[PDB]
């Protein structure tokens, strides 16, 4: 449910 692409970066 919470594993999708959110545009997050390091």
């Amino acid at each position, epitope marked *: 449910m919470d594993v999708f692409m959110k545009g*997050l970066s390091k």
Partner: antibody
Amino acid sequence: EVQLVESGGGLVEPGGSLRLSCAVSGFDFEKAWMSWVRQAPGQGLQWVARIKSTADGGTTSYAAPVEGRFIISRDDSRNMLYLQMNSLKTEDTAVYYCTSAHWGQGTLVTVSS
Amino acid sequence: SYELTQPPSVSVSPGQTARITCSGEALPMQFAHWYQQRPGKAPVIVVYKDSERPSGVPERFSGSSSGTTATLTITGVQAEDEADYYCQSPDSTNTYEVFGGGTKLTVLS
């Protein structure tokens, strides 16, 4: 559990157009950065296009072989992703996948006279 | 323009350990993700954001990432792990997505 279902693939002639649709369920589609990725027979995966979340500006990005011919768009109200494909070439023949870490089953696009 | 480099093939014996590498310039600033793709099926994620294990993925699959290399480790390899494995990461500006070339894993004997 998550599921993505693509539809709209089929046979179209070079120069033609097609519209692919993807229904998403099981995660917060509103926040998702969504991509199309394609796979020609026996080849590797090739990223096609991405659209950010509306809250992040909804910015579209395209792979260079398709830039200017294809248009990715989203409809948050219906949890739908779309790929509008134009001026299609035989080299665009592939299975088209809708993906945001998870993957749909794909839809077969055949470009042929 | 940005490319992720992945060995075309890796072969291992059942029960020993496979390491699949994915090398890219922007990996210090962008997450890598790993997908297994079985013959005739769609990719399924096995590593999310460098090192997180998606739910239902077996414990033998794990990832890590440091510097310009992300690595997928499969411990106690089985015959069932034969498949193509892809890494994915965006470019340094996070404007476009890039896939590795894929790695075909073959289980010997």
